[PDB]
Write a protein that binds this DNA or RNA. Structure first.
Lengths: 94, 97, 109, 79, 80, 98, 109, 94
DNA sequence: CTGGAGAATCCCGGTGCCGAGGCCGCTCAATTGGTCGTAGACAGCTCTAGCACCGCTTAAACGCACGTACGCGCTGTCCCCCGCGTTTTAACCGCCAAGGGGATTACTCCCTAGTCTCCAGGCACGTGTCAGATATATACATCCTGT
DNA sequence: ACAGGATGTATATATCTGACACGTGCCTGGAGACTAGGGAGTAATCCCCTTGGCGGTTAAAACGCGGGGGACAGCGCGTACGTGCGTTTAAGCGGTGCTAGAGCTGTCTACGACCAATTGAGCGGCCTCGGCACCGGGATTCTCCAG
């Protein structure tokens, strides 16, 4: 009766802000769980090396800006930094 | 009697199987292959049903990706017929052999 | 008698969780310590990339006149967009199939 | 043995149709089932050495998925 | 700086092709090899500069190049 | 009498010549002007170490020599000996670069 | 007045250091804690692989009648052995060159 | 005047046990330093995931036997496990 | 095909120059010897789900045949690339010299780990209905012989 | 090019099933407030290394002229693979039952982090001489034109 975590609550909230009259399968939700887990460990895996290369011990948001610019291609990295700095700016104001 | 000229059933099958998502290898003769490729590493291994279907989604994604690469080797040599020159070239360029 | 507990995902206006991502960074063996803005930055990047796919996968579902996204529509969304295809070029999607392209030499004329 | 023959001539031929193949020479059906078994001998021997490390006797679905990811062939839909 | 891709001259692409065992070379191979190499340098320098300004220094070091090649899957030995 | 080797024979002796050596085949000064020309598209007034340009040097010939090996087998497969720019486009698409 | 300090590389009969490898595991962000036999196992695997290359690179140097191993001999050692070529198939060795092979179609007859 | 570490002491000891009348360049020692650093982070990087997959927190020698069997090919992995268990057996006896 | 000519690589041997190897301080990171708490081992138990079986249906593989379009070889023509000599260009070398910025050592402060407590967000579990799969019959579009 | 027939394929309606979407109740992971220790930001200094410049040498690049080998279009001949029909062949289903092993819980014990005082291994600098790089020279191999 163990409790196992996923992102299926949060994917279904983002879907209703983009297509509010569209659903998803169970097999397509298990792929969107595999997507979020994969992109998490790419960015956290690259930010772990950026902190290690510069002999730091803290992963800040600045090691995640650089890991986004390394991993995400082209214009897809340009909107993801805009979406990232805006969330940090709103977080420190509240 | 009626007769399609050779090359017209082959194109509607390319149109057919690029529209579907099914597994094209039969289920049971693929389970019997997995259970004997795995019997020379350990005897009496067991498999989950989602562990064999994970192997079949990967082997069919590998071969369909190989036949796209092997088709560009036959078009490059001014053919349309695949022949194992073309497979052995695409295996070498991707660093597999 | 302190205050009502506000989630850190609502301080930044996000839907992906900040508190869960902060735990997974700190228990995932990435560094000795984790900054406070680091899960806020990462949960916004993860939310943008899922919003980018579900927008394209939702379009492919209405073009096939369906209201549920099946893994075919996720395959068609990723392999048609040029930036998601390069982010996910080594990734197999189960029950996704391929994209229909016949080489033009094979078409009869 | 005799289980590699279960991947039949029409099963290889319709995998070739999804890849876009128009016509197949007859010496391909003994070529690709040799290419297939080299692929499975690399994925399974990493899958079953995850089961030995976890002291299991069954091959779970995650052991195939972790074995595929380290060959650069990551799979979405099984965990 | 401008018009530096033709510093990779016609006999220099030919000497690179003959270390790869090429016997005869078409004349249109040269304009693509200027473009194939320029795409490759625009991906390693794009990552190597990204490692420099993360560390806030104006000098692209040799370790930044070795790191930028390693994340493209082309590990290089001999520089650290 | 003016003496000339047949077309092909000094091509083979300088396939043997450069497969035996380790020297860098691109001249060093025009390559260093190229690196600094490309790098201005990302930051102005950058500086380079000497060994950072020589690391980009070593990486680019290894990419090209490895590519001219793959594009040669695409030309021999098409039953010819001359590499043409359709052969580079085949080798760069099977590997997954284009 | 305790005892003379013995290195952990001499308890196992190794040349690669066990104490340095133990620090690099524990400060390299790999796990919460590191077993005591883990750097002993890893420093022996690293010592075998360098002994395997320097045996083959030392053979290629005496076949070229030299007594110093230059990076050409490391390239010839790795690309001729079939197991080191697959371990190091995505690795460029600087100043290593290639191996001499002409395709047999190109040779004249 | 900072002190930077390498493996150049230890590579030169292994060379004199294999070819006792053979030397090495400086550029070939900098490649053997790049080799040892690379194979270290492959094995320690794979053993870090084996401990994480089984929800352990300790990297033991048993997570390094499995990472050797995953990474090293064929017979080259078979002699490296023999060289590894023998060093652990000699270590626990002394 | 069968030999002299001529070009190129090769083996030798001698002279200089510097990079490897071996040395010597000395600093600091590995070692030794205890101690403390918790990770992982081992035992017991639950109950999921993996393996094995039989039977009936029928979809799919198999085998055979026929003929057509493709692979492959042969041939011929043009023009493109290779080899080589002459002239032009700039890479290469060594040296001179300023100064930008990397690489330290201090110093402080503020950010993050750690802790206890409170509590709501998210997981497991039910539960009903609507998306959709399947059937059945159309019109429609498309291939193909004969024209 | 062109028209009719025939065989697949899209369109539309009808029906059932089961999987998604939702609600509910509980638990544990997240948030609140707080405290204290060290990471990193900031400032100052030092000197390595990077940029810039200049002139002499000569190698390598650019240009150009023959001309010959190879790309490539065209042709014809004969296998060999595609289409289709009839006949075996086991895959797929579904239903039933057994139980091996995954998973969980709850012990406790040995193992590893932590600390501190100590010392020797490894690192940086400092020299020396031998490997080796290169220049000169004669000899072997090898390509190619005429015989």
């Amino acid at each position: 009766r163990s409790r196992k975590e996923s992102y299926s609550v949060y994917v279904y909230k983002v879907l209703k802000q983009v297509h509010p009259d569209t659903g998803i399968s169970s097999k397509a939700m298990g792929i969107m769980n595999s997507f979020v887990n994969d992109i998490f460990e790419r960015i956290a895996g690259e930010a772990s090396r950026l902190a290690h290369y510069n002999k730091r011990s803290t992963i800040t948001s600045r090691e995640i800006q650089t890991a986004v610019r390394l991993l995400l291609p082209g214009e897809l990295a340009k909107h993801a930094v805009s979406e990232g700095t805006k969330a940090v700016t709103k977080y420190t104001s509240a | 009697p009626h007769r399609y000229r050779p090359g017209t059933v082959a194109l509607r099958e390319i149109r057919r199987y690029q529209k579907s998502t099914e597994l094209l290898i039969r289920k049971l003769p693929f389970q019997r292959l997995v259970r004997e490729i795995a019997q020379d590493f350990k005897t009496d291994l067991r498999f989950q049903s989602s562990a064999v279907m994970a192997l079949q989604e990967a082997c069919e994604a590998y071969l369909v990706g190989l036949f796209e690469d092997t088709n560009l080797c036959a078009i490059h040599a001014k053919r349309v017929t695949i022949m194992p020159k073309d497979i052995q070239l695409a295996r070498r360029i991707r660093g597999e052999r | 008698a302190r205050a009502k507990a506000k989630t850190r995902s609502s301080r930044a206006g996000l839907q992906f969780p900040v508190g869960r991502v902060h735990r997974l960074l700190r228990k995932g063996n990435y560094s000795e310590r984790v900054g406070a803005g680091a899960p806020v930055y990462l949960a916004a990047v993860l939310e943008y990339l899922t919003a980018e796919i579900l927008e394209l996968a939702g379009n492919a579902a209405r073009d096939n006149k369906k209201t549920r996204i099946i893994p075919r529509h996720l395959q068609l969304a990723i392999r048609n967009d040029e930036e998601l295809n390069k982010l996910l070029g080594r990734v197999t999607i189960a029950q996704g199939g391929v994209l229909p392209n016949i080489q033009a030499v094979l078409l009869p004329k | 043995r005799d289980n590699i023959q279960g991947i039949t001539k029409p099963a290889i031929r319709r995998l070739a149709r999804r890849g876009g193949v128009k016509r197949i020479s007859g010496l391909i059906y003994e070529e690709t089932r040799g290419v297939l078994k080299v692929f499975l001998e690399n994925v399974i021997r990493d899958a079953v050495t995850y089961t030995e490390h976890a002291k299991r006797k069954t091959v779970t679905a995650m052991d195939v998925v972790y074995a595929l990811k380290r060959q650069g062939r990551t799979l979405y839909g099984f965990g």
